[PDB]
């Protein structure tokens, strides 16, 4: 399991005088992720003599 910062988000910008609209802005995500692993698993067989 790892983590992925999706985005950061804005924080209310540059008001010279109070109009009180962009107070909190919006934050981003962190998006926990996962992932597995795989495997081959083969076989083979000779008898005894065609090998000897």
């Amino acid at each position: 399991t790892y983590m992925k910062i999706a985005d950061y988000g804005q924080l209310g910008e540059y008001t010279c005088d109070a109009k009180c609209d962009a107070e909190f802005g919006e934050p981003g995500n962190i998006r926990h992720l996962e992932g597995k692993t795989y495997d081959y698993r083969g076989v083979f067989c000779f008898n005894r003599k065609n090998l000897q």
Partner: protein
Amino acid sequence: MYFFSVDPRNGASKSGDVCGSCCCESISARPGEVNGVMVSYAAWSAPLRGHGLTNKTTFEIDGVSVTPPKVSNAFGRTKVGVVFEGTLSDLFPNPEGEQVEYEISELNGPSNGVVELGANGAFTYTPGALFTGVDRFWFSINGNIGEYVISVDPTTSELPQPPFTTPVYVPAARRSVDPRTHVLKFVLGVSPAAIPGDVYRLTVRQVAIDCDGNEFVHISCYDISIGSCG
């Protein structure tokens, strides 16, 4: 510079200096001037606490007295650099018989050329060298003023046909608004062809905007009176 304090729409109104005689407030103008007008919406939009005014003002002009003009207007066309010639006698169809005192006012003459008034309704417009555009000049056929518009074409194909500026006009984009103080400014232009005595009516539709983005519309009117001598 005219100034007007707009009524606040409070159910209590009619501020001090009020000359009961109409609804729309008065504006006096003189033919030729181009003056500047101010309107203070502070009384109406300040209580409406929000983002103040916006640059979405809308103007309209309609005349309550026209007295149609005597002399017609005209249009002229010529390429760049080439001298232009034209007649000024078929523009004053007069009902009665009287001479034709053609005159060109040195105040409303051309801006990028020169004009020599002939003996009988003929004039020579020699456009300025290395110049292409539209140029006018205001003749006066026996008192009745009209404009003669000329476009000098940059020798390639042609130029369009401009719309013959009205008696009273508010220029395209010369207005502004200061949302910090709720004050509107615009320009009020009076053509030199307006007849003294007429009255035109100017309607102004101003729109405020709330804290979130909705609208508060406001309508007011004004009565422009074309009077001679200021």
